[model samples]
Target: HYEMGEELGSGQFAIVRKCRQKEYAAKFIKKRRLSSSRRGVSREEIEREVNILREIRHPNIITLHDIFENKTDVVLILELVSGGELFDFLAEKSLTEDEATQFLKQILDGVHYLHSKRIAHFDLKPENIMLLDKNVPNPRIKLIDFGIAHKIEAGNEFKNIFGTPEFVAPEIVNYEPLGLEADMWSIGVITYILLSGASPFLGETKQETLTNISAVNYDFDEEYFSNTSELAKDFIRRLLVKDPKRRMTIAQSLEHSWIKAIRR
Candidate 1:
């Protein structure tokens, strides 16, 4: 019932476009892999992911309004996020502590909502973090792109090397088993860059970046971290640990002094 407009965005497996519906955007996930189905007995990954997206409801997360499918694509109608990425906003403005705290809290809350249901976003980067409306006094953070998200099952031993290089966890870099803690690692990288405007483990080459991540070779330089408080730095430190078992959980992060003190 909606008229398709211009392209909003596109990625490896999906393309997002604006809709004449005004308040909605349409995401088309291409069906390329035959392995996604088995003699018409099993559902496709696109269907599974779409099912998960349909059930998610949070102020800081994008809403899936409707769905459509064709022979080659599964189209999802999502709530339009008019305010550009938080990453772009960061590039344009140097934020104060209050602003950074508020932003991180919103992200944590969104992730907390997903983790509470045992779902792992698998991919969490600044590009996927967006704002509802930049013109608002406090733009609401909206987590998007659940294309690679997974419902982590206990004792399933799910392992995969996926996600953005700079924001991935040590376990992912090492090709070890992954879980919810992987998202926490990405959150640490996100928080670090939010405050310092610098990526912690990014290197000149992809291999070098992977090496740095596998080794957990990162530290706050005085140049970028001079003004950041110890509490904030500590929060990042707790989450960026090489051992996923030791990394901070969403609940712990939400309860941390920095987040708890600034939460609204």
Candidate 2:
């Protein structure tokens, strides 16, 4: 038994709560009510999420503390984090090159490890990444939200297309079989935002945003990137390429001069 505290967040079918008894954050996902049309349905994604969390062990990834369930729902007890989503922290943090650079490095490190394990985090965005503390100078990173993750083995391709429209890769929009390469494209978008504090492919509407992502129609606007480094731009260019094969992999990103640059 646990005592619930303030609600941290909510999603389509679940709500996250901070426990008073302990510091763990519990995520409760409701089980769909059985019906004629939806009867005998199974939740492949729920099973996948749990298995992935159970097997994974990394500093950047969310550590699954415990799991509990009843007939109506399942509860995921997770590590409670104080710092908020990267979406809000990024605007301020983007002004400092050292913090931004270090943050990107931590992301790259986490993705690299996931890729090595044959897992591709299909969804990688600011809201999914969290900081260790809100007020800390150089807070640690926590890569959360694995709802759309899938195993991407080498020399094999998966055809299911699903990702946030803004961060979805060209291959996904074009309906091509995608591998781990898709995740790289997302990192590029995230890096661009980290440096400029704005989205690279976001448009006025969701359709337009998807269109821009499909066309790879984005640039370093002078208004935002006048003070940004060429090295940073190059890094984005390598990963944002239309061709997945031509895009920079996690290994290359980790070794890139920009990420390798001495933190100032």
Candidate 3:
């Protein structure tokens, strides 16, 4: 038994609502149309998303608790995670170095787990990571929104370009084949954003941003480096390589010093 609460968020295809079941608080996503031409994201997409969620069950990944459908709507019951987003936290200028380290560690754990299962998260960003508990020093971070995720055999390549523009990998922009490594690039960008509170490749226009990303035009500002550690910057450098083949693998990333803080 459950009772629905107020909406927590609304996106192009879904509306997330708060709910309670027994002693547990949960989230329910109600699908809707964003445009008339897209067919409003079919039921097959939802089914595929559910299958991926069921297959890649892990503690650091958000769990799909239930799925319900009616004539007009399909509801996906998800675990309610409280601490909001890394972006919002950054906006408040409150996170410390230790806090960022802890959050990134949890994200890597989930990402590494997904890669091990041959699943690729098309969308990887700070906004999609949810904090599950508030009291813990390094709270559990759960990766959410697998709507664009897909599973493939080892070495398989994907060509469809999807995900937020700022976080999209260079290969994606070029319409080239990509695999799990593309997600790593986005993670690197996210790490940069966490430490600097600014995007390395952001520009006044979309074309300018694309050019910067393609050329790997980036430099660490010494002024911003005062607070961030060298180890953290090195980790970002390794993951932000423009060449996909040269990017750090999940195993290599796990062994990096910056990521070593939460390794247990």
Candidate 4:
């Protein structure tokens, strides 16, 4: 057991604190409720998240160093991502096109890596991506918050109405079985937001937002997006397709014209 320090951050269902292991430096600690008899957060769901994180390992994904379990809470020891969330940065200082491209490329790299392992990062928004170091040029990104992520076979189908409202795919709202393509849809939304600095399908109310998402009611104004290349728009459109089956796969997206430009 270790002494918990000041909280680093908080999410919808968890609290992250700065903690220290014996003879080790401070680390970020995530504590989540494993069993909430009143709220219906079952033990099985908690187990699924733990099992997934335990088996997955990637450079861009936050490292899960240790896991501790008690009767009610599950404690996760993770690397402290010092720069905080990308969304916060975006709100403070708008990124240049090059910076945006680099950031988006890194995120895609992480997503591609996850997809290669048959893991889907159901939530792929700016807030879920943290900068590993504050000083590095084009700082490395660490994908976080896997509470809603799930693993599915190549052709398997899934049905779950979960994920942030602004980033969820249309198929998810329709109650249709989704797969890896749903993740791609989220990536598209992130890309659009990074370039435009606004959610493509946002509204004043939750119902309005859902309606916009269902209808794909978003238009890219050339004035606001003039600086963004046609290739970027093309990639976003392909991945944001209303039809999940037509959505570009991770591999395909990595090879798209926009992504290729980032490599140059």
In lDDT terms, which candidate is top? Answer: 1
Candidate lDDT values, in order: 0.86, 0.82, 0.78, 0.75
TM-score to native of every candidate shown: 0.87, 0.86, 0.81, 0.83
Answer with 2 or 4, whichever has the higher lDDT: 2
lDDT of 2 at 174: 65
How does residue 255 of candidate 3 score in lDDT? 90
lDDT for each residue of candidate 2 in 1-264, tens digit (9 for 90 to 100)? 788888998877778999955588888877656643353223666778888888889898888978887777788888888888866776553256676787788889899989998899999998889986878776889998776787764332433334346775776566645688999999999888878878999999999999999999999999999998888899999999998999999999988998887765
lDDT of 3: 0.78
lDDT of 1 by residue, 1-264 (tens): 889988989887778999966658999887764665432212357777887798899999999888887777778999999899997976787678877888888999999999998889989999999999988787899999987788886442433335346775666455645689999999999999989989999999999999999999999999999999999999999999998999999999999988888334
Candidate 2, overall lDDT? 0.82
Clashes of each: 0, 0, 0, 0
Give the C-alpha miss distance for residue 136 in model 3, angstroms. Answer: 3.6
Q: How many backbone overlaps does candidate 2 show?
A: 0
Q: Mind sharing the TM-score for model 3?
A: 0.81
Off by over 4 Å in 2: 35-42, 90-94, 153-176
Candidate 4 segments whose C-alpha is farther than 4 A from its true place: 22-40, 90-94, 153-176, 262-264
Clashing residue pairs, backbone N/CA/C < 3 A, model 4: none
